[PDB]
């Protein structure tokens, strides 16, 4: 609506976590989640 926001609101990834054996966090940044019109301007390829 007004105040476009476009930021995380609800966390439904998982319900709970009890035991953690590893943790890692990156540096702060800001990513634009605003919608776009037209073709796909971005490409991401990952190998795991």
């Amino acid at each position: 609506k007004n105040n476009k926001s476009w930021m995380e609101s609800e966390f439904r990834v998982y319900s709970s976590a009890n035991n953690c054996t590893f943790e890692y966090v990156s540096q702060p940044f800001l990513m634009d989640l605003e919608g776009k019109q037209g073709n796909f301007k971005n490409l991401r390829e990952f190998v795991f």
Partner: protein
Amino acid sequence: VFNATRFASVYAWNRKRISNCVADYSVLYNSASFSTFKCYGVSPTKLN
């Protein structure tokens, strides 16, 4: 951990798992900041 505000009781001793980091034992073993120190099975120098 060594200087934490509070420690758990002897019966309720906390089990802390440490990983995903580096350990600098030179400042710990060689600082002579503790009354007594001993190791079982491996000498402190070899552990470094």
